[PDB]
Amino acid sequence: STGSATTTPIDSLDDAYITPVQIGTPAQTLNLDFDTGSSDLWVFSSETTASEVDGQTIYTPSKSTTAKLLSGATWSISYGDGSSSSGDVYTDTVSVGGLTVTGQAVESAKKVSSSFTEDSTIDGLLGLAFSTLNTVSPTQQKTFFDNAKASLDSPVFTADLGYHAPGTYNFGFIDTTAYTGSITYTAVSTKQGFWEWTSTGYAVGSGTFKSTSIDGIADTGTTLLYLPATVVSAYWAQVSGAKSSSSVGGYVFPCSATLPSFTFGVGSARIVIPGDYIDFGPISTGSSSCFGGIQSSAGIGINIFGDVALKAAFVVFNGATTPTLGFASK
């Protein structure tokens, strides 16, 4: 089997992407944030504290003839950005782009943090990291991909995120029309539960490539590109007037600037992030100070190839017995 679904930016900045997901019988369609940096599929629901729902579409398990409470199971997750959610668990039928999994754990939120409430466009998350990170207790549950894998034509999914435009998540096949040149595959460590890999270096604008190993994660659920302070300083030094602002929480730059591109290495291959992808607009409405899309990972504890990086590529998440990651230009 295969599946193919369009993923759409939630706003004009590409702060996140949502993908429609069918849950239950009859189908209830929720728009979920596909997150290769976590491993829980959780949704706003009829069980979510009412004051914490503000415009989201909810899953109502009592209206699904295929929903079954997973007795005794609870979940609770905290994300890198400080947000969190928790609740109980159902199993139900979940379909993405025509690919159907029966008995998928659907984690129903009883509580969500303010960041989730305040974002009316995201109805929940669909985790695509390794199932070892799944938070369901006392019996850990499998991700949608892990459940689907054996049925797929090939044990892969691909992320093709758009810049200020829709893109595609495919399951079970590689669309050879969706990228240019070849896909370069690179080794993955699953030791931390992430799609963790080592970039071979970087360049800033038309500058020379610096060969240096940068370990990080391919994370569709993180907006920005978080890299070591040395790398980030080298980038922003090429933008007149850019500075790190403690009060704002990262590098800012004059909105009048033209940003240079940023290149990252995948083996001997190179992915070029155009300068415009690095612009996250005014820090506050009407400001002429703009927020940068490349930020320091210092004190995150890990480098994160988030959407800023991934949207410059066609990305293969290869879930073969030994997982790997592939990147192509597009």
UniProtKB/Swiss-Prot annotation:
Entry's Gene Ontology BP terms: proteolysis
UniProt keyword list: Aspartyl protease, Disulfide bond, Hydrolase, Protease, Signal, Zymogen
Keyword Acetylation annotated: no
Catalytic residues (positions): D35, S199
Top-rank taxon, per record: Eukaryota
Record's keyword annotation contains Disulfide bond: yes
Enzyme class: hydrolase
Catalyzed reactions per annotation: Hydrolysis of proteins with specificity similar to that of pepsin A, prefers hydrophobic residues at P1 and P1', but does not cleave 14-Ala-|-Leu-15 in the B chain of insulin or Z-Glu-Tyr. Clots milk
Disulfide feature: C255-C290
Gene Ontology terms, MF aspect: aspartic-type endopeptidase activity
Domain Peptidase A1 positions: 17-328
EC code: 3.4.23.22
Family the UniProt entry places it in: Belongs to the peptidase A1 family.
Name of the protein in question: Endothiapepsin
Organism of derivation: Cryphonectria parasitica
